[PDB]
Ligand binder design. Sequence first.
Ligand SMILES: CNC(=O)c1cncc(-c2cnn3cc(-c4ccn(C(C)C)n4)c(N[C@H]4CCOC4)nc23)c1
Ligand SMILES: CNC(=O)c1cncc(-c2cnn3cc(-c4ccn(C(C)C)n4)c(N[C@H]4CCOC4)nc23)c1
Lengths: 290, 293
Amino acid sequence: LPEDPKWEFPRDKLTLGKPLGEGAFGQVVMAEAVGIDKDKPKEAVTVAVKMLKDDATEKDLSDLVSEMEMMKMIGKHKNIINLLGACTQDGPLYVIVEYASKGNLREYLRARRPPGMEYSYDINRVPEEQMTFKDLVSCTYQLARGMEYLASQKCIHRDLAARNVLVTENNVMKIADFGLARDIYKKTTNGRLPVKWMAPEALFDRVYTHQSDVWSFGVLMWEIFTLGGSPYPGIPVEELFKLLKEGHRMDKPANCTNELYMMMRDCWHAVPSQRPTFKQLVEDLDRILT
Amino acid sequence: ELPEDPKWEFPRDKLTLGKPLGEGAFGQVVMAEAVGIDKDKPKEAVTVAVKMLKDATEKDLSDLVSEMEMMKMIGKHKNIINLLGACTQDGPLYVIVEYASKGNLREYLRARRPPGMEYSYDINREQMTFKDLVSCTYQLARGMEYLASQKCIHRDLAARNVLVTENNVMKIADFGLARDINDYYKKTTNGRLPVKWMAPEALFDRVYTHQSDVWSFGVLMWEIFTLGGSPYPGIPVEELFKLLKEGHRMDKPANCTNELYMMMRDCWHAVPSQRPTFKQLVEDLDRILTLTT
Ligand SMILES: CNC(=O)c1cncc(-c2cnn3cc(-c4ccn(C(C)C)n4)c(N[C@H]4CCOC4)nc23)c1
Ligand SMILES: CNC(=O)c1cncc(-c2cnn3cc(-c4ccn(C(C)C)n4)c(N[C@H]4CCOC4)nc23)c1
């Protein structure tokens, strides 16, 4: 792998830590980096490094490099997990990205559900108490702002879901895993069946567009206002195909205004060209915030 | 097998292909004609250009589909090559866009330079005036300000990618193309080295913004008032990196007022946040155009 001084970070100044989780690209590990912020070059900063699992092929290795080199292309934004640097030449490939202390969004919302209406036993959070409606509309607004940035850079996400959203310690929403490569199932990875987030054109024809991500914004909105519900609850994958081309759609979440739910279904238009653009989603969510 | 969209489907019977025109990164574009593509006049044949694949991969098919469906989202404008229809489901994919009879701008301008002032041996054409040149820039700024408002970044704005219709309307083209993994870009594509149209911040950080699109507008202006000149004449690409961040810029073209050349340099501002918006470019370009004669 060629050198890149603009992005290279020395492994001496990088100290690994406890693992965080795993994804389609490998595993992501907590870490600390000394001087990764050039402005404050004697400061330890908490970071997350993305690396391969101990059983990955080179197909998986080029797919880690090809996400890293795409993260350099699309720039930085407040509502995405940004790239900080990399370790290339010696040993394993580390990819250093921003750290979000409050974890991922789906389990953040599930932990803050009302008593007796939990998803699973797990552990609840009453220091966090419970979220308000205005709380919820700004999380999607932040994500619309972030999705409108990625769309403007001609980037397609292909798998936008609440589990792939991350929360910083100031409750900032950060879209993650947007540079992954596309390689043409019933395999639940990380607790989710990804086919339930796909637009019909990507589910039946395996074709993706910025409009297809708009379909996956709609489901994301449904996850948010149900505080982490699971879409199409308990429906077999074999039946979603038939149910989808029949015109059936998900029901209106409680504690959610009609105009938001009528915005939810316009993302689920059968024709991609008929779905809203990210630009008007940002216009409408801003107006609804006040 | 591509999804349906009735509003945009055009029957393949009524479309008869013709001689090829040229190519881009997206495939080939070929002359053709379509009967009834204009619904208001349904018994009329209209000349169109259709974009199709060259052979090209399964990846190349998705980037045509996402360029076609992105052209539907950003709307229509007088100063861009607009989408007219498509043939999707029953055969190979055809994307039908507007036809500009006079070809691209760079060779349009080069064909119209004075005797003895040629760029190359091509049969010439009937010479453009100063008012001709300024309204040509105004039209293109109007088109870029529309594209910017729809959150669109061009990334490769050059005279060769502007086309002229039969009444001299300027139309920006290839604005919805997908972004791939970085071409060396130092290889001549379509008679130009695209690296000479890139802003330094997009050169050194490989990230594109609306402020960089203004930088390539400035280069574009230089192309126009030199009637199809070649930017940075005889400078090696390996030296252009240093030469740009050293502050060197192209010289003021003849038959071009000082205020236009100092507008050209404000496009080439070192600080991107300081370059003007297209919104302000059309406002100033409007002012220069109406004190024409
Ligand atoms: C499956 N992971 C991704 O897809 C991913 C991709 N790129 C960057 C990340 C990432 C970035 N900051 N970050 C912070 C944490 C974290 C912090 C505190 N906790 C626990 C103790 C509550 N977990 C984290 N943990 C995983 C575990 C479950 O969900 C996120 N993942 C990340 C994640
Ligand atoms: C990189 N080009 C594009 O991407 C593109 C995309 N979509 C539509 C076009 C297009 C639309 N109308 N049109 C007309 C002509 C033309 C007419 C008359 N001539 C001369 C050769 C006799 N050439 C034309 N010629 C090509 C050949 C040289 O420059 C462009 N291209 C177009 C172009």
